[PDB]
């Protein structure tokens, strides 16, 4: 859609990160917080990169082997 899709997904992921930081289990709390929040950060970052590279692409797919029926 646009960069605002990335911004909205970031808002959702940040809300989840804050609520998990608040609601992290007491046992291994630092482990839970670091693992989950950093996992969310890396997953979202790589999704956002993949989404942005395709948002306004400068190169379009080109091929000479696609059958016309498909």
């Amino acid at each position: 859609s646009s960069f605002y899709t990335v911004v909205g997904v970031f808002i959702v992921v940040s809300a989840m990160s804050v609520l998990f930081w608040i609601m992290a289990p007491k046992n291994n709390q630092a482990v839970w917080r670091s693992t989950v929040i950093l996992t969310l950060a890396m997953m979202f970052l790589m999704w956002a990169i993949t989404f942005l590279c395709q948002l306004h692409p400068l190169v379009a797919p080109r091929r000479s082997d696609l059958r016309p029926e498909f």
């Binding site: 082997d65 696609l66 059958r67 498909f70």
Partner: protein
């Protein structure tokens, strides 16, 4: 011996992967019959891959029975 277990693992993976491949060929999936170089047969390739998956199923059953027996 470990030969039976290795063949069991390979044959279970064969059943799963070749069943998925045969289904994708039968449904004329883009990633498998889309290209000109890809087989024109479609469901005819699906039948062959189904037969191969059945062969791997026979191997899987035989080796799984053998490893439990041994």
């Amino acid at each position: 011996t470990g030969k039976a277990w290795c063949c069991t693992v390979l044959s279970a993976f064969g059943v799963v992967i070749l069943s998925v491949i045969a289904h994708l060929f039968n449904t004329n999936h883009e990633s498998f019959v889309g290209s000109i170089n890809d087989p024109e047969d479609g469901p005819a390739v699906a039948h062959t891959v189904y037969l191969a998956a059945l062969v791997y199923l026979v191997f899987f059953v035989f080796c799984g029975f053998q490893v439990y027996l041994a």
